[PDB]
Amino acid sequence: KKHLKRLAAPHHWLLDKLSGCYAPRPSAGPHKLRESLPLIVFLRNRLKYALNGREVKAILMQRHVKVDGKVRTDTTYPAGFMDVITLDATNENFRLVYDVKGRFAVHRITDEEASYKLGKVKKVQLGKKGVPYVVTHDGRTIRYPDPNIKVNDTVKIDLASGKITDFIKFDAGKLVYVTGGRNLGRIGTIVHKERHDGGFDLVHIKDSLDNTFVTRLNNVFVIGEQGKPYISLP
C-alpha cells in the first residue's frame, strides 16, 4: 500500500486526527516505518517552521536541513530515534527522544552533542576478507570495531567520520532507555537480565523512584552509566 489514513497514522507522531484525509507515508530508510518521524511532520507539525507540505519541500530544496550531518531533500525521509537534525540558518540542533507518553520529543542540544550520536549494536560479524563489522540500529555498517564490542552494546558514533569514538557494554547497573512496549520512553537502570534461550529475553529495570518493570531485551537501549548519561536528556 502507498496511502496512509491519518487515523491509521502512528501514535507517536502526535498528529491531530482531524487535519484531513491522508498523512505522510514514511519512505524506506534507516528507521522502520512504525518507528520513524518523517521530516514533513517534524518541520511542519512539531517545530511549526512550515505551514504546509509545499513550504517544507521549499525548505528542503534550499538544503537547510541536515540529518546526522547529511543533507536530505526527501520530504518523507524517515528520521528516527537518536537522530541529529541540524538547521544551520537558525543554528538549531535537535535530537529525537521518546517521551514518557511514548512520543518523539524535539530536544535541543549543543553543537558538540550534535557532533555525535548513539547506536545500539544489532549485529556483529566478520565480512569478506575477514574484516569484522557491526550493524547498528540505524543501518550503519561500521568496519573494524573494537573487539570488546558485542551485540546489544552501545557505540558513540562521530557523525563527521562515521567512526566509533567509545562504547558502553550491556550490564547490570547501566542506564537504559526503553524503545518499545508500554514502557516506551522510560529511563532506568538494569537490575537483572532473565534469559530464555529460544525465546524472548527479559530485562528488569528500576527507575529513580525505585519502581520496577520488565521489558523485552530488544526494546532496551543502553545510554550511559547511572547518573552519568552520555547524552543530554530533556
Binding site: 501514535h11 507518553k101 511514548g102 512496549g181 508500554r182 516506551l184 524472548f200 520488565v214 526494546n219
Partner: peptide, 16 residues
C-alpha cells in the same frame, strides 16, 4: 508470556 505491546488507549486520557 507477556506481549510487551504498546497500547494507545492506556496512554490516552479517558476523562471525557
Amino acid at each position: 508470556h507477556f506481549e510487551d505491546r504498546f497500547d494507545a488507549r492506556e496512554h490516552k486520557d479517558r476523562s471525557n
